[PDB]
Design a protein around this ligand. Structure first.
Ligand SMILES: [Mg+2]
Ligand SMILES: [Mg+2]
Ligand SMILES: [Mg+2]
Ligand SMILES: [Mg+2]
Lengths: 222, 222, 204, 196, 222, 195, 212, 125, 195, 196
């Protein structure tokens, strides 16, 4: 039994024609106090997976160490560690999902909501969610916390079902994600203006964007 | 419930969904959440259904008597003042959450009221369980100097976000347009995007299927 | 100690072609103990029919109260109250007890004598009006009734066909509820004739 | 909320953020927490929104009736009416109000009224959840008899920090200037104050 | 205090014919008033012509299905590739569930297939391992809406032969796969109308001696 | 308090009511009459909270006796039962409700018919061929469902009642010290002394 | 549930209803509350359904192991005590069971044991167990004699369940009958209350409280 | 714990420790059992190199396991006490769970099982 | 469970124990023997929590019978009582304590004296001329304080016991369905069949 | 408590008040909250006094054993050991610790470890109940690459304000300077810092 202390808010994501996009702000809240501002909540695993984490930051840092150790362990006695036997997004997710459900079953959870975004070896987009309860689900768009309530509706206007994915470009997809982040800054009392964004494409690979800001805001009607 | 209100050029428009629930069960698939306080002042209500209907009727009644007493068309701020003082007096026990809008000799107005008796002003507002889904759309697409047709589109789009993404909201979209110098235009079932598909089978029973013990003619006359 | 499920019971109403139907079960119990199998839950004031589910003492009290009020109405108005008007009276009366309510689930049914239009309506315990073209449900097997009605119902049923639909809706819903059943009554209502039928159902 | 009021050479200035909260959801990002109870007597509001409105409306009514009989009320008188409501209804209220007004005899005055309903006349006052983070800054930077431009900068910088650390504060910084010249409304947007 | 359980909503339905059996379930996944996924399957082919669904708390549901699938695998390893009969599967699932009697899997479980005489079979379980073979069973959030309809249309309850004075019952007979799918589709469209946690899509798994076939149908998305 | 029963037969209503009054681990009395005559052809038995029972019974008795004197007329059993129900229906939403359950057995002289009404403390009224309050019903109702016929005589009703008391004396946890039996018919109210 | 079993001149009658409930929700009407342990042993189920189902089939496995090891069918006393000693180990953990172990052996004759989840074990001639036990007792006790015929005893057991099925909201569905003799148990059919009630009402003239 | 396998097979397929235990039995005083038409009689030898014995208190050769079963033995006296104690405990345990005293076959089968267990358990002879 | 009594007279100990077994609103049995013979001259009666009572009684019985076989000797009543007390004294600080109260009546053959021991679930032992557990004592102790003499015969003890049962049947709230009476003396244990 | 640690040009400085609290009673007015875990790795302590001592003692033991085998540990390593104890025993601990040390390769470093047991490397850190009142001041006044005298003044002024507003803070201001030159202890009394 826990209570979360230092926390991170929404993580948002979606699929597009060639890959997936994921984003999360750089804030570590301490209750109502906006305590830490240099917190990276997107953690890449290899060159084909990004894990976005919300909730307790001490538990997030623990999960970082686990993923770091997983890469090390996979390389052991593995000549194809950077080829056919490299860590897939599906492998990384299932591992985390196992851990999350085991910890909830021992009544000592990792107080987090997690989204694993990546591209598989065959080119297929991977996007799946898991949280402190061990609950898992997948969707063309996925978001945690406030993102679930405010980002998902906006992202679903772009990709409402499976057939909308081939019709959605990386330009259109990123535009929707960046817009959603602005809306969250307007309306979430534990969001920050600064955020990170990651694109995992089947052709261009992993692009990690740091120190992004929310811009073009409307206030003058005040 | 999902309700919104949006200001435009020469007036104000409000909208709402048409789903009524008791727990997870849908009681009414086409209930009317748009209420009339006076001919050109209309109310959208979420929360405890009986409270929103009763409080809108009581103030509507007193507004009519006031209009007759003063030989003047009723103002939105009068309805706002009466509603908020009534709700405050009951310390939130009357669970009425309202978006009040209308036109009067002073101009066009848009307010919200919360159950404890707090009021606020805005060019765009949203209340109810689907307010976050609606507000996400409003924050994304709203601008200064909207036309009538643009405001109706924005309002109904905000309600649709609630219909699709919020489980508390569903079915149809009701709209009411209050323009300065014109009659208020109530648009019942302005949109109907949730029509029930044809059933696979008719469940009309052969006559005599039900076993009967007694028959008797009932006297309704004097 | 949940007032709405001590005694048990159900009521359902439906519309058809130039007609309406309202039905109810006959059980009255005290939690697990079945006490009475003659406790009807449908009453009428002139041509307007009212069904009431919930705490039985309040069912009785409200019937007596609305008989009281509709009698004074008729004396002063010199005409029988209509379903639309009576629906409003029920709503007013329930909301008057907002912070000390009658634990009931009433259902109005009838045909307007002037227009000829079939009318049904439902309420929560504090007076919220639920109007419907098709059907209204109430009681401890309301979930079951919602499921039965939504699947079985079709519009513009003839009185004889409507009887079969509403009866099957009630019976099969009641059999999936421990606190409902023990007999049933169905009212078929036309413009100027009303037929009352008691249904044969399982007595467990 | 983060709110404050500061006396200076020519009178007094009130300041406030624009955030309204119901949990972590921002119910309104463009709120007006600076409220008129008389021509040149204004209040800053913190706590319950329903409570602070009901109070401010009653005060405005009392001072309007005072004016009809006895002419312009003093700022002290306005604060006393706020106190009377806050003190006598302390069990049912959550209201932290700062009262600020301009007389010609008394110049600028600031009265703060915390939860209990006590009154405290001060050179300047800070209140709301975000005020905790600027006690250090405000104490070190406040001077008596500042100019209009200096006082505006003091409030702008102060509320900027309160907004930066308090999640319950944000949006725009509204200000109201009370002097012999009249009443002036100021607004400052994120793009300006965030990068101070 | 940490609550190890959640409610992921949705509803499931199993019907058995003479030489076939169906196990249907909606594809919507929810928490509180939000939709997590519009397509998240919860009816699975477990091998040996056994289909299974564990509806309720999805984390427990996935865990159980995962353990049973694994049980089938080891049954082959330990008993010379012998086919696991539906009755044996049912008993095995009881022990899986009851093994967590004092910290239960929060699910209503249904399995379907053919018995050892080739006839259609449906088994249903309570959360702690109680089981029973039936012709008919609905499960999950809308079970209370659907089940009485099934009693009436599958088992012909409360239906008497016309003109027989309520003395002769309507005779029991097996339904064709065409007739069964009609009832499934109508059951789910009705449940979608009146239950907020039910909608989006319907996935039916049909089991005959030739194998396991799938059919998908759209449901209302509000 | 505890056990009160009622059976309506062809020509009479029979009420049986336990004699024990228990407080703590002591039976303070074994001859208590848990009934009041409301009018010459109407009898009410009662059970429930200590004090409340008698206070309520006597209050109703006073009111019906007042009515009888005023109008020089006896109210029908149906009328008396409705009056009692309304008093309990008022009571349940009072500051301190009467926690009393009653059976009303009467003979309607205008209809020449016996009538038995069961009313609980909430004000829940039902007319019945046989009735019971408290845990008694859990045994007696099923027993009477089997053995009761509508055309029985008073003597047949008493034997049917003996069968109920025997069952209760066998399966009930508490010693209720037997019952006082009273009959209501066309000739009024009388007590059976040897039961 | 309502279950009963009584001893008489011609052996043992065992009768049970078939309803399952989850609160006020009627979950099933077709439940098997009698478990056939061996050709001479029966077990009745009341209370927690998984508890009853799991542990009584487990009991059957323990009885089978006894006759393999001892080359002799287990006694009713020993069979009932395995179950009572098992549930006693779980006392306080929250098991919910009201069971009756009924059967015949040479050394014992016809025997009935009541076993419940708080560890109570009682030999006896008549028991009724379940939420509707009192309704069954009322009819059974007032019609019971030792000298009942096999035909009359079967009916009384059937009629007692019917009585409880009618009055108890949490009992119903159908009646399952069993007769236990020196030669073993004999099944006497499933009897739906839907038809059985009206058949009994008409033929017996009882149930006059109901609208005919 | 002491784990050594003391009872093991030899090349010719004999377990010498079990066979040497039989030699200890051969050394013990003679015991005889004869069963009639309606009785069983247990006879036992007592060696007479021990005079000045106290026969009141000296352990008797025939021991009651229950009120209806008896056990005599030949071999190591100290070893027999351990078997007798275990048998007596099992006798009471059987009465407790089965509600019936042990059969002679069952009691024998138990005692024999204990003896067998000590032939393929580590650390014991 | 509920009523267990004990009286020690000149030459014997007499135990009386109620026959009822009640669960909920149903008396499941009216012929229950709430006692176990520990040894030929020692008898233990018991009352308390369902299941615990019999489980504890039989466990003690098994242990004393084991001792008897091992030593070919009968333990004294004093020795048996001390063994029982220690088991209950252990139990009270266990994870789940035995909630059982007992009376031990025995005849010491070495002393030629009857002995009665009262032990509660905490392990509180006392030797007494007369004893009781539960609410019974609130009536019987004062009664026996008045009528008991130390030099009474077994017949006088039975009459004294009848006086206790009569008082309990008059003033106790629950029907305990009479008692089974057993006598412990120099010749062992026997049951009185007509009480 | 009010505590802080600040990196600067030549290394890092730790700062703390001297107040120990059991309720409103000051159990010790001359407390030493700056503790040595290694020659040039020190910690600042806040929260439970028993918890923070038990932790610091265990860390000191771990680093002493580290030094015996692998030589001088990095400041990061010391912070990791603190984290490991705070994270794994989060349910039973109330400890807010700031770790600060001087390497020759890495110069001055500051790691803060809040209640949950997370680690945060920062240019400077503030913690304790009194830190809330100086977030605004410290953010506005901190600069990177300050001198020794500037950093001492920054800490002195900051803790002065924290002490002024926080009742749970007071007494003397202790400081510990970590540079290549060595270890220097500083103390500042009320009569000096109060009138800043
Ligand atoms: Mg039913
Ligand atoms: Mg902020
Ligand atoms: Mg739906
Ligand atoms: Mg029933």
């Amino acid at each position: 039994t826990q209570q979360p202390i230092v926390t991170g808010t929404s993580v948002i994501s979606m699929k597009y024609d060639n890959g997936v996009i994921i984003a999360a702000d750089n804030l570590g809240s301490y209750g109502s106090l906006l305590r830490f501002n240099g917190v990276e909540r997107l953690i890449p695993v290899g060159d084909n997976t990004v894990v976005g984490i919300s909730g307790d930051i001490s538990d997030m840092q623990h999960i970082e160490r686990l993923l770091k150790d997983l890469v090390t362990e996979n390389a052991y006695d593995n000549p194809l560690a950077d080829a056919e036997e490299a860590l897939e997004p599906s492998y990384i997710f299932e591992y985390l999902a196992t851990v999350m459900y085991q910890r909830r079953s021992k009544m000592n959870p990792l107080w987090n909501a997690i989204i694993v975004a990546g591209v598989q070896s065959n080119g297929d987009q991977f996007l799946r969610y898991v949280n402190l309860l061990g609950v898992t689900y997948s969707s063309p768009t996925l978001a945690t916390g406030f993102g679930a309530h405010m980002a998902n509706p906006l992202l679903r206007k772009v990709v409402d079902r499976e057939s909308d994915i081939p019709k959605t470009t990386v330009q259109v997809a990123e535009e929707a994600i960046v817009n959603a982040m602005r809306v969250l800054y307007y309306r979430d009392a534990r969001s920050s203006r600064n955020f990170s964004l990651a694109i995992i494409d089947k052709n261009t690979g992993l692009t990690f964007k740091k120190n992004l800001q929310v811009e073009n805001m409307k206030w003058d009607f005040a | 419930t999902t309700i919104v209100g949006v200001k435009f050029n020469n007036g104000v428009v409000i909208a709402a969904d048409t789903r009524s629930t008791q727990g997870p069960i849908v009681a009414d698939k086409n209930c009317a959440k748009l209420h009339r306080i006076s001919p050109k002042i209309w109310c959208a209500g979420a929360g405890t259904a009986a409270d929103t209907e009763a409080v809108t009727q009581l103030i509507g009644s007193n507004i009519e008597l006031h209009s007759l007493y003063t030989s003047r068309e009723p103002r939105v701020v009068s309805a706002l003042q009466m509603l908020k003082q009534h709700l405050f007096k009951y310390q939130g026990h009357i669970g009425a959450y309202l978006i009040v809008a209308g036109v009067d000799p002073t101009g066009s107005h848009l307010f919200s009221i919360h159950a404890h008796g707090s009021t606020d002003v805005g060019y765009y507002l949203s209340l109810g369980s689907g307010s976050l889904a609606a507000m996400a759309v409003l924050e994304s697409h709203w601008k200064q100097d909207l036309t009538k047709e643009e405001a109706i589109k924005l309002a109904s789009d905000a309600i649709q976000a609630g219909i699709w993404n919020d489980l508390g909201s569903g079915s149809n979209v009701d709209v009411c347009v209050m323009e300065i110098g014109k009659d208020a235009e109530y648009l019942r079932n302005y949109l109907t995007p949730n029509v029930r598909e044809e059933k696979q089978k008719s469940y009309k029973f052969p006559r005599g299927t039900t076993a009967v013990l007694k028959e008797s003619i009932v006297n309704i006359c004097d | 100690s949940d007032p709405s499920s001590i005694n048990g019971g159900i009521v359902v109403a439906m519309t058809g072609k130039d007609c309406v139907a309202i039905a109810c079960d006959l059980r009255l119990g005290s939690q697990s103990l079945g006490v009475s199998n003659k406790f009807e839950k449908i009453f009428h004031y002139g041509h307007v029919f009212l069904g009431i589910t919930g705490l039985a003492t309040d069912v009785t009290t409200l019937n007596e109260m609305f008989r009281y009020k509709t009698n004074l109405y008729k004396l002063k108005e010199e005409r029988a109250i209509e379903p639309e008007t009576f629906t409003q009276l029920v709503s007013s009366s329930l909301y008057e007890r907002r912070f000390g309510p009658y634990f009931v689930g009433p259902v109005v049914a009838g045909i307007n004598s002037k227009s000829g239009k079939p009318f049904i309506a439902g309420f929560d315990l504090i007076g919220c009006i639920d109007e419907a073209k098709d059907f209204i449900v109430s009681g401890t097997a309301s979930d079951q009734l919602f499921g039965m009605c939504e699947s079985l119902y079709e519009p513009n049923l003839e009185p004889e066909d409507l009887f079969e639909t509403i009866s099957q809706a009630l019976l099969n819903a009641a059999d999936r509820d421990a606190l409902s059943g023990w007999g049933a009554v169905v009212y078929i209502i036309k413009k100027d004739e009303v037929v009352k039928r008691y249904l044969k159902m399982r007595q467990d | 909320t983060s709110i404050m009021a500061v006396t200076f050479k020519d009178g007094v200035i009130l300041g406030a953020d624009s955030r309204t909260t119901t949990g972590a959801y921002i119910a309104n990002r463009v709120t007006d927490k600076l409220t008129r109870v008389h021509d040149k007597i204004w209040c800053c509001r913190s706590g319950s929104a329903a409570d602070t409105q009901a109070i401010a409306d009653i005060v405005q009514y009392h001072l309007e009736l005072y004016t009809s009989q006895y002419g312009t009320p003093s700022t002290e008188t306005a604060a006393s009416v706020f106190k009377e409501l806050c003190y006598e209804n302390k069990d049912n209220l959550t209201a932290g109000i700062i009262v600020a007004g301009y007389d010609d005899k008394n110049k600028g005055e600031v009265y703060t009224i915390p939860l209990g309903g006590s009154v405290h006349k001060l050179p300047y006052a800070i209140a709301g959840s975000g005020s905790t983070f600027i006690y250090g800054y405000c104490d070190k930077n406040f001077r008596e008899n500042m100019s209009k431009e200096e006082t505006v900068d003091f409030i702008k910088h102060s509320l900027s920090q309160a907004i930066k650390w308090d999640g319950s504060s944000g949006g725009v910084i509204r200000m109201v200037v009370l002097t012999a010249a009249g009443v002036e409304r100021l607004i400052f947007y994120p793009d300006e104050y965030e990068q101070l | 205090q940490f609550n190890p359980y959640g409610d992921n909503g949705g509803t499931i339905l199993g019907i058995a014919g003479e030489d076939f059996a169906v196990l249907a379930g909606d594809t919507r996944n929810i928490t509180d008033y939000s939709i997590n996924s519009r397509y998240e399957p919860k009816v699975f082919d477990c091998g040996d012509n056994i289909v299974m669904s564990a509806n309720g708390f999805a984390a427990d549901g996935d865990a159980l299905v995962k353990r049973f699938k694994n049980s089938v695998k080891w049954y082959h390893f330990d008993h010379n590739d012998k086919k696991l009969s539906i009755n044996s599967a049912a008993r095995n699932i009881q022990h899986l569930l009851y093994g967590k009697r004092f910290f239960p899997y929060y699910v209503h479980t249904i399995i379907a297939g053919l018995d050892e005489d080739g006839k259609g079979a449906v088994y249903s379980f309570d959360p702690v391992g109680s089981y029973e073979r039936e012709q008919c069973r609905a499960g999950g959030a809308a079970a209370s809406l659907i089940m009485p309809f099934l009693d009436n249309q599958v088992n012909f309850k409360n239906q008497y032969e016309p003109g027989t004075n309520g003395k002769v019952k309507k005779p029991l007979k097996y339904l064709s796969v065409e007739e069964v799918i009609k009832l499934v589709r109508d059951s789910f469209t009705s449940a979608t109308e009146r239950h907020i946690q039910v909608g989006d899509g319907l996935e039916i798994l049909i089991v005959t001696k030739d194998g396991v076939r799938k059919e998908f149908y759209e449901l209302k998305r509000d | 308090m505890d056990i009160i029963l009622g059976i309506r037969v062809q020509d009479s209503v029979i009420l049986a009511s336990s004699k024990a009054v228990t407080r703590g681990i002591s039976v303070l009395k074994d001859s208590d009459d848990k009934t009041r005559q409301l009018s010459p052809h109407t009898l009410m038995s009662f059970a429930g909270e200590a004090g409340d029972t008698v206070q309520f019974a006597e209050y109703i008795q006073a009111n019906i006796q007042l009515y009888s004197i005023r109008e020089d007329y006896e109210l029908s059993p149906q009328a008396v039962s409705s009056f009692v129900r309304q008093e309990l229906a008022k009571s349940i939403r009072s500051r301190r409700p009467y926690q009393v359950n009653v059976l009303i057995g009467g003979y309607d002289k205008k209809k020449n018919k016996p009538e038995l009404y069961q009313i609980d403390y909430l004000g829940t009224k039902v007319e019945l061929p046989y009735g019971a309050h408290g845990y008694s019903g859990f045994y007696t109702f099923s027993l009477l469902d089997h053995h009761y016929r509508p055309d029985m005589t008073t003597e047949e009703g008493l034997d049917l009642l003996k069968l109920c008391v025997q069952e209760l004396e066998k399966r009930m946890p508490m010693d209720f010290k037997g019952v006082i039996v009273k009959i209501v018919d066309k000739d009024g109210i009388r007590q059976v002394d040897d039961f | 549930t309502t279950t009963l079993a009584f001893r008489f001149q011609g052996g043992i009658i065992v009768a049970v209803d078939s309803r399952a409930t989850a609160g006020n929700w009627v979950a099933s009407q077709t439940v098997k509350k009698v478990i056939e342990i061996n050709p001479f042993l029966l077990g009745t189920m009341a209370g927690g359904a998984a508890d009853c189902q799991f542990w009584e089939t487990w009991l059957g496995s323990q009885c089978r192991l006894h006759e393999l090891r001892e080359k002799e069918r287990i006694s009713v006393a020993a069979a009932s005590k395995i179950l009572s000693n098992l549930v006693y180990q779980y006392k306080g953990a929250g098991l919910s069971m009201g069971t009756m172990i009924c059967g015949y052996t040479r050394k014992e004759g016809p025997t009935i044991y009541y076993v419940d989840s708080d560890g109570t074990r009682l030999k006896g001639d008549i028991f009724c167990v379940g939420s509707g036990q009192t309704f069954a007792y009322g009819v059974l006790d007032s019609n019971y004699k030792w000298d009942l015929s096999v035909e009359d005893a079967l009916y009384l057991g059937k009629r007692s369940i019917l009585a409880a099925a009618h009055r108890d909201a949490y009992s119903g569905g159908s009646v399952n009958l069993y007769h236990v003799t020196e030669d073993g148990w004999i099944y006497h059919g499933n009897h739906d209350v839907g038809e059985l009630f009206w058949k009994v009402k008409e033929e017996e003239g009882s149930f006059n409280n109901v609208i005919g | 714990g002491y784990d050594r396998a003391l009872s093991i097979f030899s090349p010719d397929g004999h377990i010498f420790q079990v066979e040497y235990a039989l030699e200890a039995v051969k050394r013990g005083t003679c015991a005889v059992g004869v069963k009639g038409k309606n009785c069983v009689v247990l006879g036992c030898e007592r060696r007479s190199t021990l005079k000045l014995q106290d026969t009141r208190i000296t352990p008797s050769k025939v021991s009651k396991i229950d009120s209806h079963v008896v056990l005599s033995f030949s071999g190591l006296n100290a070893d027999s006490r351990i078997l007798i104690e275990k048998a007596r405990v099992e006798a009471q345990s059987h009465r407790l769970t089965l509600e019936d005293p042990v059969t002679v076959e069952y009691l024998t089968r138990y005692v024999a099982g204990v003896q067998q267990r000590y032939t393929q358990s580590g650390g014991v002879r």
